[PDB]
Amino acid sequence: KTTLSLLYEKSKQYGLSSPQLQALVRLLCETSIIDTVTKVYIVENCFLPDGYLTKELLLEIINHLGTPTVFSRYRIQTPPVLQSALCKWLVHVNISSSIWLHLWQFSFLQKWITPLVIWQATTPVDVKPWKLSIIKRCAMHPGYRDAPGSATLILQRFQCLVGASSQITESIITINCNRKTLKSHRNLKLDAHFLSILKRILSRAHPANFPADTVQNTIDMYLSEIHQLGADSTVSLWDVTSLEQLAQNWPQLHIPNDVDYMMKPRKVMSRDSLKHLYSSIILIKNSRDESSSPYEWCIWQLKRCFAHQIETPQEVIPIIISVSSMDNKLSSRIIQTFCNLKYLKLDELTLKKVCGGILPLWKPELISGTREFFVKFM
């Protein structure tokens, strides 16, 4: 135990690299001579991640996460409490999504796998009906107290991701949930004291890339996403999910018309990065003309703010400013239509912030008709 005690201090001061983490967890899972309680303590405290764990390190943890069965003759024995603690440390730090769900059905892992399967799944293609069947199976089968609450979370995550399927409420009605696990599974262990050591280790090792502070923001993005649900080729504009994959099918990419879904603000790149390019895509897919749907959307949403039909007037004001900067032929109609004093009476404050951000950009177009119209405004 003296060597292990020295290892704990050495691992605490110098952290643990990704090759070191997988080598240590392999040796820890290989032998069971040491006590089970100190094996849990090693993963919980002695293990120190650097940035985010690599896929191979996650795969090695997946190997050791398997619960002991009658098929344990050649496998290396691992206590269920060690397996629960091994995945608990994973909470602290397409094919992958399927791996987690097959690991989630185990009783001692359902409380810690549940965040992992949500993180890896970000596309509707990963949602399959047979996965939901396994989820509801683990939910209904008794003896798994933490399953139905965790089952509902994965059910909601899959249903919201696909966006078009049969209602999952019937799969939650047939199962019994006290909702105390659902609240617990929704929450993620912050581990604030562990976070400082994680920051220093990511600043130290190994390549100073893919920092976990950014992953912590992604974890916060993961945390926000979990809470809201709990409580060549011819494809569409949103059927793509990667920027590089969008370039290949660009000559054959057709755009469906869902305007504000463009405007209203991991294994595969997130959608948020695409929507910034999506606005420019429509600006280049369609030439600047009065018949463009997004251009008409800007006019319609502007009228909503003046009449206070929108929930909050300033929600779309920054979006309109960015779009209306260009299109001198259609920047005038933003001003010409709304420079009348009748709109001023409805709301003088909203007119000010849209007037000041467009007039410096705008160019003269009308030879006559427009000096007097503006002079009338003064």
């Binding site: 619960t67 002991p68 069965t69 009658v70 344990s72 269920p80 185990f106 009783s107 001692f108 939910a139 209904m140 089968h141 008794p142 003896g143 798994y144 107290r145 139905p148 047939t174 199962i175 019994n176 006290n178």
Partner: protein, 92 residues
Amino acid sequence: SIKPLQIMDLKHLTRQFLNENRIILPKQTWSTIQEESLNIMDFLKQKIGTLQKQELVDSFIDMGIINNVDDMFELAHELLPLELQSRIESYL
């Protein structure tokens, strides 16, 4: 006596049952079930004497709980987590 289950024990058993299928039961039924649980403990002790695997299997087959050792470990798998049934299947 000490053996008959308390109210919370029956509540947890019916929580397992609810996980199997949503079933509603009232309070005084828990005290009635506790008394009849002492009675059924006597029933089972007279049903199952000195603990032998074949003896217990035959007793539960006669009682209608199971049909064979297959149903034995199937019910064990239904009512319990994985590792205990790995142990059971090693034993059975």
